[PDB]
Amino acid sequence: SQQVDKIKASYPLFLDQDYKDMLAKKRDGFEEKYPQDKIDEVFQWTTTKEYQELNFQREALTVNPAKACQPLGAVLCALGFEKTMPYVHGSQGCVAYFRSYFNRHFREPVSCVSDSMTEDAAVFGGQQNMKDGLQNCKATYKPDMIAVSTTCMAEVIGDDLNAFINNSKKEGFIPDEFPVPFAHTPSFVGSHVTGWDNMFEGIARYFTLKSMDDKVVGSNKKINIVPGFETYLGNFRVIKRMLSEMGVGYSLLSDPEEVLDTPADGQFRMYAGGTTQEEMKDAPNALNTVLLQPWHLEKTKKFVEGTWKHEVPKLNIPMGLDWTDEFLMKVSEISGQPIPASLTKERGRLVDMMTDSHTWLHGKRFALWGDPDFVMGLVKFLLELGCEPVHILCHNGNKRWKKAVDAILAASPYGKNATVYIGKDLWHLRSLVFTDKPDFMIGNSYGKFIQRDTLHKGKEFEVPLIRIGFPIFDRHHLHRSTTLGYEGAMQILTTLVNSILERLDEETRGMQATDYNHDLVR
Amino acid sequence: MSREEVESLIQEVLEVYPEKARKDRNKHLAVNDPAVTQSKKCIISNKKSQPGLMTIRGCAYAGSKGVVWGPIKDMIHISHGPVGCGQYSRAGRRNYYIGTTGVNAFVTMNFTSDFQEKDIVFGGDKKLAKLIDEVETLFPLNKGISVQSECPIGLIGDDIESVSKVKGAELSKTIVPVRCEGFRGVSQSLGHHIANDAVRDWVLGKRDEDTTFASTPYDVAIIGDYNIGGDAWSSRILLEEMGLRCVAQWSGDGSISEIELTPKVKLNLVHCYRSMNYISRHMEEKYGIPWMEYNFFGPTKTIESLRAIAAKFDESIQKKCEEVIAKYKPEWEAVVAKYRPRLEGKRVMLYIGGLRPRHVIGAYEDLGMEVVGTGYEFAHNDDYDRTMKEMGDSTLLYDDVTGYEFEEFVKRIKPDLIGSGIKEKFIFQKMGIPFREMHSWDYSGPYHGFDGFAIFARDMDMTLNNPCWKKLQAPWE
Amino acid sequence: MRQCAIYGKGGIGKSTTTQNLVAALAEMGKKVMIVGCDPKADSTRLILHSKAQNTIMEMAAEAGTVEDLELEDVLKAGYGGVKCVESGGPEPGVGCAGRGVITAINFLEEEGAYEDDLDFVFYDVLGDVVCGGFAMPIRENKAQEIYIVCSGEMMAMYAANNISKGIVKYANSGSVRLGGLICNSRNTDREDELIIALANKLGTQMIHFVPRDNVVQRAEIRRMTVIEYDPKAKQADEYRALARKVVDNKLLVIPNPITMDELEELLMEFG
Amino acid sequence: AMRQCAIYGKGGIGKSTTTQNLVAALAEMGKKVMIVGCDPKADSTRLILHSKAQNTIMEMAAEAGTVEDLELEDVLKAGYGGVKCVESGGPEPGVGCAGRGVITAINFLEEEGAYEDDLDFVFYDVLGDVVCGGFAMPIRENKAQEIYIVCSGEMMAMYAANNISKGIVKYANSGSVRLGGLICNSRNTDREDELIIALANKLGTQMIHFVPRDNVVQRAEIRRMTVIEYDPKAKQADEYRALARKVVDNKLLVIPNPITMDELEELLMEF
Ligand SMILES: Nc1ncnc2c1ncn2[C@@H]1O[C@H](COP(=O)(O)OP(=O)(O)OP(=O)(O)O)[C@@H](O)[C@H]1O
Ligand SMILES: Nc1ncnc2c1ncn2[C@@H]1O[C@H](COP(=O)(O)OP(=O)(O)O)[C@@H](O)[C@H]1O
Ligand code: ICS
Ligand code: CLF
Ligand code: SF4
Ligand SMILES: [Fe+3]
Ligand SMILES: [Mg+2]
Ligand SMILES: [Mg+2]
Fold first, then answer.
1. Residue D160 CB–ligand 1 contact under 6 Å
2. Is A220 in the same domain as A314?
3. In chain A, which residue's Cα lies nearest the Cα of B121?
């Protein structure tokens, strides 16, 4: 039953007596469900340490992974170039899933196409599909450049992207001068960050490997910045703002913030901003190339050093005090532009926010997961805040990144009780937070189920989730925040301290029971 | 618009394609004529999508795993292959259920084999057997395992049938191998067909000899409702208030026991014909169980469906149906009185998957709004045959429409509301046209039944008459 | 209905011998079916009078999808009423022939080409067999008897034992069995004794000793099989004897794979 | 001079053996020739390294877990005359995907750096049944630019050569890979030499060398020592030196064009 003046959605409509009675009747009559005591016993067993040993003895089953496949990152990289259409050679379901994923994270239109390869195309090859798809995309959506990625189906059968595109140009389906960079993005190797790296490397090769005869390092007096797989527009904005404040000429390659923040003014803009083709053609002339997320830009680093002859600095991600200062100093040394007073004032303000909030941030135990560079930057920032990481998880990390994070932890007294995991999933993290309980979890929206499980065990075992990462689906407009630089550090610090204070306020709201600590001033 | 103008718009839109693309797409656009009972003479459906035209269709893996097998809660569904698919399809569909996730329910969970290069080169049979062993070790309360094959599995010829058979025989478990590779077919419809075949072969006939279940002459099964925010529950409360006993729900909030008990029912109530027509026909042919289509979208369709269902039974069922209709009349009458004045005369354009483009027209007409254009992602010619009757004169019908085609069709029609998926929501929101997600109900619902009608009316009113749509133009421009 | 699979290497005479075998078998009054898992389409080129036929996958592509293809468009009669089909596939160097044979076999299973009104079904597979697509013919509800065609060369033994090792997994999982070894003589020194020893180690039975000649090539130039090019030659009688003995064969034994040191020893005792 | 070549043809004609003795003859007077084995059977490097098997790329990738953490020297080894050897490897027959293995092994070799030293020859060895792009990777861009087809005088060799020439049209019209010549491995066929030169001029090319069906090769294979290793003074040694000379001083390479079937039908009548 519904009252028209107060209409109920599914919650709390299905909490009514008739719906509850019908649910119970259906369950008892036909569901053949296990008894509730057995369910409680199994849940309690899953919260134990023997279950943790069984979970960590896994070898072939992955439960709730924390990574995606390469073509997603390839599409995100292709979106950052001017009037560029991300083209995925393979099946249409992959493109649909990519578009749904990015629509849910960014709440923005995401343009991506496919050749819709079928069984006959899987058997005879995708030459005709490539030709017709390139022709149709160019005719219909009129882009200035088409960046080709691959699905696993094409990679398994060994589609020759170079030969296919060359034959497409040779038979007149596309103009011979039309830029069609391509990259191999096998989904069974690496993850989405590897796809971003592969796509950027392919585009850079396409515009710069055949025209290195008339290139001189430092001709244009600029610094190239490669941001990598980034889902926060604030990071692009803050890097550009900092480099403009320092008065440093920069060429940020693969900048997608404009197409992911289009205004709503009555017209739909498929393309907006993006790195221009002239910028990438003039890329080798820069003084140096700086990689913001080096731990998933290895192929790009190798190509840049081998072809552009750029001495890429050994810099960490500009996360936190120490690494932001290192980044600024390296930029100042490369360009010769001194660090101005505005950045010094920003650093001083950030140190004063750290001083203000250190009394609440100290000693807190955190579990975190995400991308390698992002995770290591978050761990470093937590170490500068006096916090104690306990469980560090990176599903797409390797042994070298784990060694670097271990060295970072050993360099600090707050990393004594910290362990790093690579190749594990979120089920392992749930087992960890049940056995070795941290105060908070920092991750993407997939940790809300872990929070649900911990709450189901009890209010004293609940591990609240702090949403910093990709993808975030259950909150709105969090992609507009900033992670890099001093501004991102202030944002993260404010989020952390306010989360701690909100949890404390929740724990002390009981009247005549726990309200003696419901202080007005915190 | 006049009929001569819809054709002109169609031609002007098609003028940009190359010759082959234009010739192919000219067969997928039609002007509706309710007199014609054969949709083949006007529109062409169920063909491959043109390459590079930004289609909205999915794959067979979606149509099986995320549609049919996924809503089943007591089973564990393995995304056999690379990670992507499982990750992109995890908890994206709001097939609601009741259970303890991680113990006895696994709908929102993602189980995957996470194939690597060595798995492709050397195979995945041993890895699949080890994965099944670990699934049984770590999740003892599951009532079955399903193996959803992603593309590479089909390509490299991994034999999951034998692995499933051996592991099920040795572990006494129901392990259902599904060949739902994405490159098969053209869209999710073949995924529906493959999942239905798997249900028929490996699950449906398990209790063919068990006679312990006592059957009443008022036994029904809801077929093809997936509980998108509680729609299956809303329909079930109406069906049970009629004196009818629902034994099975396919597959929203469904359990493997309900699937096993289905062949004992007296009537199959099919909501989504497109997804479960094959299994309905198989049950009719093998067990003699009749099936019928019912629609619970809006008060008129709901009342007609309740009367049609009650017509299949004795006089007590009809009396209870009359009692339910009389009880629920004032509520939906009040909802209409509240929300029809705010929504009268508004024009709606729809683009949804296989069933909802024609099922939701009744509610929009109940609220006083008209549908100027509907379209299907993957529906066959029978769905369009049913669609011509429900749509008015000189209304546009499109199949496998592209983003370009939909954009300019909306630009030339200027509909008051657009109901489609997440891949067009922001495109049409930035154009200044109110948009409603017709797949997930915009994280609201349910919309089925008398209870869902109020939520539907409230949602349409709040989206259409929001003050934000009048603010897209800066005063200085 | 008996479903048989012919394995070996390319160029030994897998197809050739299979085609004359089934032609002779049809001459005795057996309804036989040849399913060509060779993407080169050369397994039915002596029974069908068509030069290139109308392959399963080529018409699946011409019809849009496989589901739109009917059985009658690809299943055509040959000499002696022999039903035959061709899986088809891509040109060399592109695509995936394994998916081609998988799709063709699933298509045949879908529309019931095994109508229970036939006697024998012979699968002509690729020699390389480097993926599961070409191992599909030896799965459950598929060919049960495997006849490995070998030649006098030592790499013929190597491929035979590697193929047997591959069969081992399906024999253990399913019920497929190694039937025997059709050894095609290459006019080498006392090869028959070595092949007998290899069969004894494998536990199987050597099938027959069809020799190397020229009438088979002159019958091919006529574009039909050996038996009905000149029903009289000795080779035709040997092929008919082969048909009779594979009709009355009943010994099915799991292969026992040997190491390369073992194979070196068999080369040693007969240099 | 960084000359990347590849051997094609159907299995049984002797592509592997031919390239093993070819590299052995090349290695006499100072070649830094490296050979790549794109055969899942793991025999393309057998005689040069004098060991039946070694650490193939896929085996070590499976042992370590990933190709990134796999060393170059763990799979690449040097043998006679500094012939640096490496082999792709793959799965046991009937399972997996060997083409993907060839693809990842070739990418491994290319991106660690193997085309850096003198590398007088980068000879590739492929299998007869090229059924996917994985086995067409050796003829991709920045790869082998000179393809040799090993063939004999016999219908099946002509069919294989025609199909391969068809397959080297797609990769040649959009690249720099051409066809070098046709290598002959005699089957002891009648007036063959004239037939083979007829084929060579039919494709507008020339035949490099004719290798008789000598019994020395089968004796050298059992002792797994190539004829150059066997003895530096044999008849085949001089013949393989002639092969080496005419393969290093080759200058003829034209885009292949498929020819019609009527010549295949009536070749025997002419000869
Ligand atoms: N000139 C020759 N005279 C006689 N026998 C030869 C000659 N060259 C090679 N052989 C032998 O012929 C056989 C050739 O088989 P081989 O495995 O080399 O062929 P292949 O083309 O590499 O086959 P696949 O592609 O199936 O691996 C071997 O027994 C080899 O020793
Ligand atoms: N018994 C035989 N004696 C001589 N030549 C034969 C004999 N059997 C087959 N051949 C020839 O051997 C060649 C290869 O046989 P075929 O079956 O076409 O190869 P594959 O083993 O690859 O299927 C053909 O030219 C065929 O005529
Ligand atoms: S199953 Fe189908 S696309 Fe019938 S794949 Fe799709 S929950 Fe749609 S129009 Mo999403 S044939 Fe259901 C559907 Fe309809 S996921 Fe839902 S809304 S009634
Ligand atoms: S059409 Fe469908 S969604 Fe596509 S792969 Fe195929 S079953 Fe799956 Fe999967 S991991 Fe990613 S998303 Fe693909 S590239 Fe492969
Ligand atoms: S090896 Fe087999 S499965 Fe793999 S691509 Fe080639 S034909 Fe297809
Ligand atoms: Fe938005
Ligand atoms: Mg053959
Ligand atoms: Mg070889």
1. no
2. yes
3. A156
